[PDB]
From Swiss-Prot, chains A, B:
Keywords: Capsid protein, Inner capsid protein, RNA-binding, T=2 icosahedral capsid protein, Transcription, Viral nucleoprotein, Virion. One of its GO terms (molecular function) is RNA binding. P1 is the major inner capsid (core) protein of the polyhedral procapsid, which is responsible for genomic replication and transcription. Forms a dodecahedral shell from 60 asymmetric dimers. Binds to RNA and may be involved in genomic packaging. This is Major inner protein P1. Its main location: virion. It comes from Pseudomonas phage phi6. It is found in: Virion. The gene is P1. One of its GO terms (cellular component) is viral nucleocapsid. The keyword DNA-binding does not apply. Homodimer. Associates with the polymerase complex.
Length: 761, 761, 51
């Protein structure tokens, strides 16, 4: 992770700063005091990591299955934020009804009409999912959704009789998104709750209509209700004129929450005796999480003061109901004391004792497996595909990687970096002014790396306080979400850690007195200068959260540290396809190593390349492959990078050799550790396979010539360690555990210290 | 071992210098050239390590069993050099015959005489070994030898009949001495050959007399021959007036060998056409080993020019026969091409390529076991004893140590220190002027450490060129032998390595033109400045041997690398006792460790101390315990010490930080390695036992108080590693693998580098 | 409830327990390892109850 510093986050992790959500302009410490309660449901965001796959057009229907994807599609990064999705679909819904044709056409595709209405239609209802593609002329639908979705009703099950089929199912999927929410996250999510309101009656009409309609007879003739059948939805289309401004509700609600908790009695702030109870947000008010949301939204908006409410009804009303209470999300409104469990602690002590190291870590234990990729392109020649994965790369590589999961028993990495303990004097007297306070058990890494953000850039921005901000709306707001959610995810592990807090002003600019922050008492430690809080008040009593948790004590991990991941094995034969893509894709990418002895530069040329035990290429396949697994590793790499940056700067800064001693130690704790890591990972076994195979091509290189032919002096004090890190490269790339790229980062550490074997072998 | 240096031995290992044997006054390089053949039987010294135990007074008799011990007694460090032994015994032999009494007394102890001569004596011949103690009044015999030995004849087996008993056996023993010889070694050994000449007839008389004597009758009455019986020996006593001056022979012989090989035709040098063949030393002349001997003796003596010979008979004669040809030794006259096999090689190459590192090592693989000690004091209340060893310490400790043997798969230690390879630039360009050339597979270490010399002091002297020389005659000449033999032992591994050589002058002072040395061609390497020899002459062509072998090539180990050691298990119940002592003795010695947390200095107090699994003390026992095992370890420790001395001096010398980089690397290759070693040795398991037991007392220390009672924060980043090196101390002392003492040497390395865990755990 | 502790099993219950079972209170706890390997394959009846 990243490290700071007791007085600081502020130079190198401003996102940490609440004031930024508060709007403190990067510097001044929460001054005000002058604070009231805070409290808990502990409170809104994601449970955790949920993975699932998706059935579409099954013909049983109902709102719940999609809106999720519709919720998800965003998550899917459908196009842009859900409300698009809802809007873009609703928009079809809007080139609405003047197409009674589809009814007319459904009626007309009621075969070929009721024109000979009679008791007749009997078959063919899987190709009118495929059919309601035929409906594409009336409504355009690259955004398959309705093009897929429009199907559902028409083939509700009605004709429940006559027809007939279908008797089959589709795929949806969804890999985890966020464990925590953000307010524009909220606005969409509400837009999802609205598509949700939308369906039922829509579910109901067809469902309703068909049972009521067919008194019959067996078939109740025809020219029938389906003519209404579809009629209801457009009717439904109009049925949306529009429920609320979800944006309106959400912003009004954020404003109300600020108020719910405000410091300033003045009335941008009149939280009622009349309505403060009244169910509603009253259970919600305690909630910190909304409070985090409030802090950010407000900075973003301040509060959007339209007072949609009156202080009675409404403020009774559009705040009557809320999205989270409405379930198109995979967010859930949080349990109330657990928070998001998953931490052991230790903290610094040269015997004095105090700390500026941390010991909070990853609570991780990732997948035991991974995925082939072949989109079974064949059936319908489009997205309709099946990867059709079979024993191939996937099983051998997995087992072999499956040490791979091993390197990163994440608690163990924190173990190493929490193994530190003594330098900087002892036992007793290490500590020198600056700190380190450090973090994270998988969700933040998981949220990004999957999302191609490569956290790292957002992270540098994070630290430097003010964000990097070149970024694309895709790019910029990847940054945004990751920075918001990351901080919040920590926060209700920060909020959770000590209930005492206090909603703080800031003051700051006016801007509208909204801006507000939180402080708490934690009692225990002797007075080792920890910011300005030691505590001076019995207890930590610092609004800065890192500040708050940090002056506290060790524990253990409640959490699973499960990597989760999705088996579709039932599907894995079942389907058919949802909106899948990123696989990763084609199975691997080539990487070789060349070694010198007797001085003959070679290059065996193994890739990347099967390695695996068959030839070759292979083909075909790849593995959008459990982020975590990439995730856990991303974290180890991050560590390397951080320490190195620090060192360089200080060594130039710190002339003293003793200072240099300290420096080698940090750089080369990275060095050493990375080196040890390399050795191990490479003696993973396959890689060891690379060692025999790549050697041999290098044997050919070792044995190309006659003179070279006496095969190796290539084996030296260095070699075994050399093609050992051939083994390192083999662990290193296209396992897919790591993308590549980084390789030079590891190089950077190896270079930094002779490292050598250092021994072995 | 020790390290040098291509241009040098001369600063830091002058013993290496032949010129010192030659007498070059510490500096000038063999200049002369001007040389003739040299050649091989390869030639005199010990086979290797032989261990055996000793039967005395069995009553079967014969010369061979003792003279060995008589040879051995010296080795036993009986008192002083054998010739003492022979002399001191011969000296009894000398308060000779005027004691017909013992005969008279034997006759008299022929029961109670023949006084009633008749056919009578029938019994009691185990207590006249014990009896011939009764003979002690006539001859004093603290030096039991004759007091024990005088017995043998009298109880030859004669009365072969009447008596009767004995029907039993004694113990002798002998643990290995030297694999190589030295000339005063020669003079004694010859003194042994002389006691050897002495016995037979002495064996023969009694043996002869008794068969001839008793025509009989059954018993042939008495008043008989035993009256001669003993008569022969004194007669034998006189029989020694004296065969040769063994000293005379030996010195005359050394002189003759010089000549045998001399450069100077002038005649301190007339090696005959008449007698150069003539069997004798002709097979011996080729022999280098005598040549090594010659070089040293001469320096010691020059040659002792009495020309005992004429150039025909004799120089035919006292050189006719020689001790080595005469077998009271455990030396044997060497095979002719094997030499003393046992070496793998690698040598330096940053790609250039050349070397100043070495890779010659220990060819070692030591004992699988060790010894209890209880001298079964009980029977006869003296030396007569039996340790009476039983399952106790010995088996458990052994198995546990038996990893102990593991740490020191000596090739593996050379492996580590031959793992070095790259620092000092690359690949390619490491080398900088100075070298290292390094050595030894067990005999030199084995010869000393057993002998309480603690090689190390002799070793510092070794290096510094001119010897330390405070030393006791015991002390000084421990130094002498170890330095002579060590060098020679290397030499006919140096002599063996390349047959080309050339007997060189020096010149030097006159002193008598005797002084002489050897040079050879070894061809192969490119011209990397290796002394002044690169070679400049096709081949190494350097008289300096290290110089000679060193410019040469890798191999493998023919030798056993057996630690040998002695099982008396048959005896282990059998006896009774020889001259045994050093055991070591009482089983162990106490050592504890105290740890601090929450800051409570403790000291668990475990010793040393059973550890073993029983209580306690125990008692009783100890283990004069396979030197090697101590031996192998002595070598690893030595390494530490050498590098550290170097570093300190250079860092003060070398201001540059880069220089310091180099320095940390050497000191802390020691550091690191010693540290790793410690971890491992301690996780030996018992020690791990110390870890649970010593912890617990420390738990008591950890749990003495209430506050302390929440047992450990004692377990830190440091702890496991702390009582882990409690484990280190446990491996560390009274296993007996190592004496102790050194502990601060390991400390010295641990101190030198944070070391830390460095990790783990 | 008489019993014993593995270290003390011999350490105390050492009498009841069979490492004694033989003579060998002795020097070292019976054991080591060795030579002719077998298990008898028989005690005989069930005799209890069977009133």
């Amino acid at each position: 992770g990243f490290n700071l510093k007791v007085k600081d986050l502020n130079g190198s992790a401003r996102g940490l700063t609440q004031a930024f959500a508060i709007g403190e302009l990067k510097n001044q410490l929460s001054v005000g005091a002058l604070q009231l309660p805070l409290q808990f449901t502990r409170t809104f965001s994601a449970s955790m990591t949920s993975e699932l796959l998706w059935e579409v057009g099954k013909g049983n229907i109902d709102p719940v299955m999609y809106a999720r994807l519709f919720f998800q599609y965003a998550q899917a990064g459908g196009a842009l934020s859900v409300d698009e999705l809802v809007n873009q679909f609703t928009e079809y819904h809007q080139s609405t009804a003047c197409n009674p044709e589809i009814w007319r056409k459904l009626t007309a595709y009621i075969t070929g009409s009721s024109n000979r209405a009679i008791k007749a239609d009997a078959v063919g209802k899987v190709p009118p999912t495929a059919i309601l593609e035929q409906l594409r002329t009336l409504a355009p639908s690259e955004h398959e959704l309705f093009h897929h979705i429009t199907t559902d009703f028409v083939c509700h099950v009605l004709s429940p009789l006559g027809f007939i089929l279908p008797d089959a199912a589709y795929v949806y999927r969804v890999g985890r998104t966020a464990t925590y929410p953000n307010f524009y996250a909220l606005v969409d999510c509400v837009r999802a709750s609205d598509l949700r309101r939308m369906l039922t009656a829509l579910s109901s009409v067809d469902s309703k209509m068909l049972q009521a309609t067919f008194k019959a007879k067996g078939a109740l003739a025809p020219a029938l209700i389906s003519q209404h059948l579809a009629n209801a939805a457009t009717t439904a289309f109009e049925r949306s004129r529009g429920n609320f401004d979800a944006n309106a509700v959400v912003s009004s609600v954020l404003t109300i929450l600020g108020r719910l908790w405000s410091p300033s009695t003045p009335k941008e702030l009149d939280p009622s005796a009349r309505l403060r109870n009244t169910n509603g947000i009253d259970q919600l008010r305690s909630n910190l999480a909304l409070f985090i949301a409030y802090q950010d939204m407000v900075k973003q908006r301040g509060r959007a003061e339209v007072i949609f409410s009156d202080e009675e009804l409404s403020s009774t009303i559009i705040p009557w109901f809320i999205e989270a209470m409405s379930e198109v999300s995979p967010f859930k409104l949080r349990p109330i004391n657990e928070t998001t469990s998953y931490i052991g602690q230790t903290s610094a002590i040269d015997h004095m004792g105090q700390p500026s190291h941390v010991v909070v870590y990853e609570d991780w234990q990732f997948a035991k497996e991974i995925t082939a990729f072949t989109p079974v392109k064949l059936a319908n020649n489009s997205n309709q595909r099946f990867l059709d994965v079979e024993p191939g790369i996937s099983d051998r590589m997995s087992a072999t990687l499956a040490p791979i999961g091993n390197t990163f028993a994440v608690s163990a990495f924190v173990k190493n970096r929490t193994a530190v303990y003594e330098a900087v004097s002892q036992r007793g007297t290490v500590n020198s002014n600056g700190a380190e306070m450090t973090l994270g058990f998988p969700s933040v890494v998981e949220r990004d790396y999957a999302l191609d953000r490569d956290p790292m850039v957002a992270i540098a921005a994070l630290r430097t306080g003010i964000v990097d901000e070149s970024l694309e709306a895709r790019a910029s707001n990847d940054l945004k979400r990751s920075m918001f959610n990351y901080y919040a995810a920590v926060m209700h592990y920060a909020v959770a850690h000590n209930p005492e807090v206090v909603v703080s002003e800031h003051q700051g600019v006016a801007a509208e007195q909204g801006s507000l922050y939180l402080v708490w008492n934690v009692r225990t430690e002797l007075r080792i200068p920890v910011g300005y809080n030691a505590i001076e008040g019995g207890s930590i009593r610092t609004p800065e959260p890192l500040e708050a948790i940090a002056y506290n004590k060790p524990i253990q991990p409640s959490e699973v540290l499960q990597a989760k991941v999705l088996d579709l094995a039932n599907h894995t034969t079942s389907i058919h396809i949802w909106p899948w893509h990123e696989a990763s894709t084609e199975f691997a990418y080539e990487d070789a190593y060349s070694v010198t002895i007797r001085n003959k530069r070679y290059t065996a040329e193994v890739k990347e390349f099967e390695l695996l035990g068959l030839g070759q290429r292979r083909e075909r396949v790849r593995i959008l492959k459990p982020t975590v697994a990439h995730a856990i590793i991303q974290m180890w790499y991050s560590w390397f990078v951080e320490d190195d940056r620090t060192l360089a700067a200080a060594r130039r800064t710190s002339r003293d050799d003793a200072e240099k001693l300290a420096i080698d130690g940090r750089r080369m704790q990275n060095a050493v550790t990375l080196l040890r890591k390399i050795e191990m990972i490479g003696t993973t076994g396959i890689g060891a396979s690379a060692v025999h195979l790549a050697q041999s091509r290098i044997v050919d290189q070792m044995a190309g010539r006659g003179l070279i032919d006496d095969s190796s002096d290539l084996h030296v004090g260095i070699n075994r360690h050399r093609i050992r890190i051939w083994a390192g490269l083999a662990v290193l790339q296209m396992m897919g555990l790591l993308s590549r790229s980084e390789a030079e980062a590891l190089t950077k550490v190896l270079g930094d210290s002779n490292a050598l074997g250092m021994v072995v072998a």
